[PDB]
Design an enzyme around this catalytic site. Sequence first.
Site, PDB file in Angstrom:
ATOM      1  N   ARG A  75      50.111  48.154  64.108  1.00  0.00           N
ATOM      2  CA  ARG A  75      51.173  47.211  63.821  1.00  0.00           C
ATOM      3  C   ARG A  75      52.524  47.903  63.991  1.00  0.00           C
ATOM      4  NH1 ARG A  75      53.624  45.530  58.153  1.00  0.00           N
ATOM      5  NH2 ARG A  75      55.107  43.938  58.998  1.00  0.00           N
ATOM      6  N   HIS A 119      61.427  43.024  61.703  1.00  0.00           N
ATOM      7  CA  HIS A 119      61.286  43.947  60.591  1.00  0.00           C
ATOM      8  C   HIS A 119      62.663  44.517  60.267  1.00  0.00           C
ATOM      9  CE1 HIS A 119      58.029  46.519  58.496  1.00  0.00           C
ATOM     10  NE2 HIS A 119      59.173  46.865  57.934  1.00  0.00           N
ATOM     11  N   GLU A 164      58.277  40.492  55.213  1.00  0.00           N
ATOM     12  CA  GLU A 164      58.853  40.444  53.860  1.00  0.00           C
ATOM     13  C   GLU A 164      60.170  39.671  53.778  1.00  0.00           C
ATOM     14  OE1 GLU A 164      58.937  44.466  52.403  1.00  0.00           O
ATOM     15  OE2 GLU A 164      56.731  44.545  52.286  1.00  0.00           O
ATOM     16  N   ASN A 287      51.387  42.658  52.031  1.00  0.00           N
ATOM     17  CA  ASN A 287      51.655  44.046  51.743  1.00  0.00           C
ATOM     18  C   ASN A 287      51.473  44.261  50.252  1.00  0.00           C
ATOM     19  OD1 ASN A 287      52.375  44.166  54.447  1.00  0.00           O
ATOM     20  ND2 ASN A 287      54.573  44.380  54.062  1.00  0.00           N
ATOM     21  N   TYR A 289      51.598  47.632  47.238  1.00  0.00           N
ATOM     22  CA  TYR A 289      51.769  49.032  46.874  1.00  0.00           C
ATOM     23  C   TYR A 289      51.635  49.288  45.356  1.00  0.00           C
ATOM     24  CZ  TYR A 289      53.864  49.765  51.529  1.00  0.00           C
ATOM     25  OH  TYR A 289      54.099  49.881  52.860  1.00  0.00           O
ATOM     26  N   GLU A 343      50.223  46.215  54.996  1.00  0.00           N
ATOM     27  CA  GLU A 343      50.753  47.501  54.544  1.00  0.00           C
ATOM     28  C   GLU A 343      50.089  47.865  53.236  1.00  0.00           C
ATOM     29  OE1 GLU A 343      55.030  47.962  54.291  1.00  0.00           O
ATOM     30  OE2 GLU A 343      55.355  46.697  56.048  1.00  0.00           O
TER      31      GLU A 343
HETATM   32  O1  LIG Z   1      58.867  51.117  51.016  1.00  0.00           O
HETATM   33  C1  LIG Z   1      57.780  51.520  51.863  1.00  0.00           C
HETATM   34  C2  LIG Z   1      57.496  50.462  52.921  1.00  0.00           C
HETATM   35  C3  LIG Z   1      58.670  50.250  53.910  1.00  0.00           C
HETATM   36  O2  LIG Z   1      58.860  51.465  54.613  1.00  0.00           O
HETATM   37  C4  LIG Z   1      58.360  49.101  54.895  1.00  0.00           C
HETATM   38  O3  LIG Z   1      59.377  48.995  55.910  1.00  0.00           O
HETATM   39  C5  LIG Z   1      58.320  47.762  54.167  1.00  0.00           C
HETATM   40  O4  LIG Z   1      57.685  46.780  54.987  1.00  0.00           O
HETATM   41  C6  LIG Z   1      57.661  47.937  52.837  1.00  0.00           C
HETATM   42  N1  LIG Z   1      57.324  47.009  51.917  1.00  0.00           N
HETATM   43  N2  LIG Z   1      56.794  47.671  50.779  1.00  0.00           N
HETATM   44  N3  LIG Z   1      56.776  49.029  51.058  1.00  0.00           N
HETATM   45  N4  LIG Z   1      57.323  49.122  52.328  1.00  0.00           N
END
Ligand SMILES: OC[C@@H]1[C@@H](O)[C@H](O)[C@@H](O)c2nnnn21
Length: 437
Positions: A75, A119, A164, A287, A289, A343
């Site tokens: 991607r 992006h 996003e 995404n 995290y 992501e």
């Molecule tokens: O912050 C780390 C990464 C960024 O580098 C990505 O560009 C973004 O899509 C994102 N969204 N959540 N975490 N991320």
Amino acid sequence: VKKFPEGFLWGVATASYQIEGSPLADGAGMSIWHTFSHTPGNVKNGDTGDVACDHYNRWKEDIEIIEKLGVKAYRFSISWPRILPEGTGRVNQKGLDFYNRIIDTLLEKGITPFVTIYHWDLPFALQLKGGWANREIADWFAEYSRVLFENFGDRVKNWITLNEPWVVAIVGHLYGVHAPGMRDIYVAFRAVHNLLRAHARAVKVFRETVKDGKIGIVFNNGYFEPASEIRAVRFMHQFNNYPLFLNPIYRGDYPELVLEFAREYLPENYKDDMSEIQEKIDFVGLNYYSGHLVKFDPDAKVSFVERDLPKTAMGWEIVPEGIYWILKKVKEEYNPPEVYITENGAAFDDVVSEDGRVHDQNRIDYLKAHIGQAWKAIQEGVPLKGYFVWSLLDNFEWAEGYSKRFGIVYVDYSTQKRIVKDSGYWYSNVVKNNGLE
Ligand SMILES: OC[C@@H]1[C@@H](O)[C@H](O)[C@@H](O)c2nnnn21
């Protein structure tokens, strides 16, 4: 063992401004990230995307790394002002050529390209005309998307309109922490709405131009838990997660608690646009995290509560079950036909040991726990078709600059040398085995 479905798409992800460098090479117009990062005070250490990972020159080596790792999908995003330097009108063949070589190389090597159309590197020329605040961006974005489809749609069959849009709108136009660096809540909610309109016009153009591919859209998501015995959590999910956009796409209106907070900030006749916004999409990209503990706070009526949980170098709490939750929840709420984790990854204070290796067991542990949870969602019937690690390469981490390393491949910026991290080696094995063991 945890084996994934046959043909499951294991990938890595990057974005153009974060890795390419050479933002003004070969006739490219400036982006808002060029001008934002060149403004003192906006990015840590005064860092910019002028050089980054020099992927603009090192693209072939980088793809050779993807190939060598056996990773099946890549991607990446396209820089709008490389393609149309003034945002609309003139098309730059050298910009098209740059991505044409990447696409052809990927295909020759049996790696599936997933293209992110936007992006965050909006043409500066369009920002002068209000950027995402201007309703006309639906037209500009449709014209840009059409150029990409006409030029690449013969080969690229998997497309993402927006990365996003919550971040683009809120972080760029309310918090002012990202380009274009504004702090106006009315502008921010107009950007939300125009992002949806532009996404929908691009899907519409897609159906007319690339009759054989698939198109979707990507959202940031967090796992919000209540600090006790709940609605503040309901609000965070509806606002910060996929519902802000999927409620319009699938149901033709914003989520209830978003309308409570933000109705006064949306255009007065915003419903007029909702029928067009429901343009059918082929997949949803999520995404994921991090998790957060959330309390109501009278002083968006919401604040985070710090938890003594393990954190990444971003200070983000590590909560693997959140990836399972968000996958179950999207099925339950909107039942999209396909889902990708577009992501997942972590920043840690990586160092090259005396042995020449980068021993990032922390990143391995992180990825392993999240991949395991994604597997769980699949067993429970979530149509997860792929999983993309953020990122292939350490890169320009937006307002944090180069101070945060997310790669499974280490980049020594003094030399541009790439060193595959232990996590990259580990992931390559996961991909080869089609799962964990
Ligand atoms: O912050 C780390 C990464 C960024 O580098 C990505 O560009 C973004 O899509 C994102 N969204 N959540 N975490 N991320």
